[PDB]
Amino acid sequence: ASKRALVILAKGAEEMETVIPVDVMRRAGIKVTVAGLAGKDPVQCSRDVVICPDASLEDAKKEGPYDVVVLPGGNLGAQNLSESAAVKEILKEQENRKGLIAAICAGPTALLAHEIGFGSKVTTHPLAKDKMMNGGHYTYSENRVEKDGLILTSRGPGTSFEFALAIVEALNGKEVAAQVKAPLVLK
Amino acid sequence: ASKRALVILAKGAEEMETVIPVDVMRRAGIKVTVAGLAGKDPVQCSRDVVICPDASLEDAKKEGPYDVVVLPGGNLGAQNLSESAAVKEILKEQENRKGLIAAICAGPTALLAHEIGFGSKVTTHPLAKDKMMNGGHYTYSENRVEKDGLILTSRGPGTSFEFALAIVEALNGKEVAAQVKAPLVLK
Secondary structure (H helix, E strand, O other), X not given: OOOEEEEEEOOOOOHHHXXXXXXXHHHOOOEEEEEEOOOOOOEEOOOOOEEEOOEEHHHXXXXXXXXXXXXXXXXXXXXXXXXXXHHHHHHHHHHHOOOEEEEEOOOHHXXXXXXXXXXXXXXXXXXXXXXXXXXXXXXXXXXXXXXXOOEEEEOOHHHHHHHXXXXXXXXXXXXXXXXXXXXXXXX | XXXXXXXXXXOOOOHHHHHHHHHHHHHOOOXXXXXXXXXXXXEEOOOOOEEEXXXXXXXXXXXXXXXXXXXXXXXHHHHHHHOOHHHHHHHHHHHHOOOEEEEEOOOHHHHHHOOOOOOOEEOOOHXXXXXXXXXXXXXEOOXXXXXXXXXXXXXXXXXXXXXXXXXXXXXXXXXXXXXXHHHHOOO
């Protein structure tokens, strides 16, 4: 059977960091649900692209669990993820079941907010490092994609293909990732 | 004053090739209009991301002209662009006024359909080469971004940042492109 991904989409999310993972994961045959934090309504992203989610988060949760939960970046999107009790519960449950969590750019600061994955090596956008590192609960990395077991993190719009392909490799393996990669015309 | 971009969004468009240019151009201070070929209604992209356009193409045209017209790829999106009389007129008018036209992946095959830019050096996605080259009306390039005067083309999802930054440099210059590029965490 196919692996399943939950992408949590909040107002102010970085739209490139939402669309690149969704599209690449669907190219890999993953069943992706784009879930709106606030409901089924369209979501205004950081650079004003408006995306209609597949489902509300409430309904998407009912259809879980998922092989990966993905948190896009964008500072305001990450703050909205960080402030959500619903996101807290989903991430706790995913951690408890030993499932992958993937977060990019400011997204990993929602892991801090929800006390997820402490003791892991993580990366973030350079401008989000100090927020992520408050309290020293993680060890910082400058790798473009960092994976410490079930916590997978990355840095920015320009690392989104690498991030998405790392998710594909973790779920579907290296050969599928390589097959998906070639038609993208990456350098 | 600010430069202005028209991005024409049709059903089946490659969503990464739509969002990356829109987002990067807005980071550059360009005023971008995402215009729906079919109307104001949401657009189902190639990998099922649903984007709500800013305006219908009909209304966007009334608010022109634009410093660049941008055509995303995706084979079915490009075919819909190729079949549209409205797109024909916009591209003819932009060519007539000596304004930039930018197209990525299968997008440049809409230039062929509408007889735009013949005698230019162009690139496309590798799988779109034969379609683009039917009749020998263009000279082919394997450069990741090709710019022959006012016809700017590129190859795939993985060249979309390079494509978008080439648009930014053409409209706003090299320094703005470099400033926009650094916070993206490109390699």
